[PDB]
């Protein structure tokens, strides 16, 4: 899917928070919030260069 | 006192349940619904809110009559 | 479900009414029994009775509507409930006659110069 793994509004928290700079899911209230984001190596994110039907 | 202490007086609702969409998004003072865009005749939908489209649209409900017609 | 379509159909209109009050009254007393600790046989009777009322009301309404269609079959101003079943788009479309309408010039030319039947020898 073209939008697979890119369906979040995540932004990196930046430095100064003792965590890596990989983007993080926004909001709160669930376990998903504050987790990894679109990045290739993250869970539930897009993979390396996605396979295209063309 | 911008943190714990200031939250003591939060006892006045800003939004109440809307009548067209059923969500607690009817602004009392603004007299409009922030979610479904009440009295505005058209349902409030934005292309930047692609997820908000897939949460309430055709086929997300009962489809009481349309299901008969399309099958017809 | 014990009322039988055959029994309902034979009954007259007043009998259908008088049977409906009896069934509604019979149902009302069965609701009291269930609340007041009724027997399972009574409770199963309550479910059965509810179907007769639905069964009885269908036949009265269906016969009344069918009689109305016979009235308005020749009527010029048919009520919208008795009009043929279509969609909103279908009603607005031009009639098949209107679509196939042609002017006298174009209709008369097509009469004198139709599409002939032929083939090429090879």
């Amino acid at each position: 899917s073209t939008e697979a793994g890119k369906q979040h509004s995540a932004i990196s928290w930046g430095t100064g928070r003792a965590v890596a700079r990989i983007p993080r899911i926004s909001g709160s209230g669930s376990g998903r919030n504050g987790q990894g984001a679109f990045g290739n190596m993250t869970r539930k994110g897009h993979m390396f260069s996605p396979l295209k039907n063309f | 006192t911008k943190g714990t202490s200031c939250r003591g007086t939060r006892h006045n609702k800003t939004h109440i349940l809307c009548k067209r969409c059923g969500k607690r998004s009817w602004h009392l003072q603004k007299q409009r619904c922030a979610s479904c865009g009440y009295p505005d005749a058209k349902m409030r939908q934005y292309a930047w809110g692609y997820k908000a489209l897939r949460r309430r649209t055709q086929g997300t409900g009962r489809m009481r009559h349309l299901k008969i017609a399309l099958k017809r | 479900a014990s009322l039988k379509i055959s029994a309902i159909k034979a009954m007259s209109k007043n009998d259908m009414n008088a049977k409906l009050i009896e069934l509604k009254g019979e149902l009302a007393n069965l609701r009291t029994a269930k609340v007041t600790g009724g027997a399972p046989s009574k409770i199963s009777r309550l479910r059965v009775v509810k179907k007769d009322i639905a069964r009885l009301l269908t036949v009265m309404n269906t016969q009344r509507m069918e009689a109305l269609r016979k009235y308005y079959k020749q009527a010029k101003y048919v009520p919208k409930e008795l009009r043929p079943k279509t969609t909103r788009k279908e009603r607005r479309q031009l009639t098949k006659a209107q679509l196939n309408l042609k002017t006298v010039k174009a209709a008369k030319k097509a009469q004198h110069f139709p599409a002939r039947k032929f083939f090429v020898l090879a």
């Binding site: 063309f54 | - | 110069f113 599409a115 032929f118």
Partner: protein, 92 residues
């Protein structure tokens, strides 16, 4: 070699793939057969002139044109009103 590649715009929305090509043959061939069964004279692809190509690069070649002029029908003794009914193309 100096590269001139026009991919700065969003080509991904400009990409057209031909996965329907093997099914255009089946569609067009079947429709082409269906017309023949309906009125076989219709699919005859009505007769067309023999006109030269334009420009001096092609002017020695002949190709089918569209429609016979009203003078060519008169020369061949065919009515222009009846010509269209018997599979002749007419181009006034």
């Amino acid at each position: 070699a100096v590269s001139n590649i026009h991919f700065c715009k969003d080509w991904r929305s400009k990409v057209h793939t031909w996965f329907k090509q093997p099914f255009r043959k089946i569609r067009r061939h079947q429709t082409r057969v269906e017309k023949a069964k309906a009125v076989f004279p219709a699919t005859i692809k009505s007769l067309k002139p023999s006109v030269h190509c334009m420009n001096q690069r092609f002017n020695y070649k002949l190709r089918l044109g569209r429609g016979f002029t009203l003078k060519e029908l008169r020369a061949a003794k065919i009515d222009k009103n009846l010509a269209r009914t018997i599979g002749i193309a007419v181009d006034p």
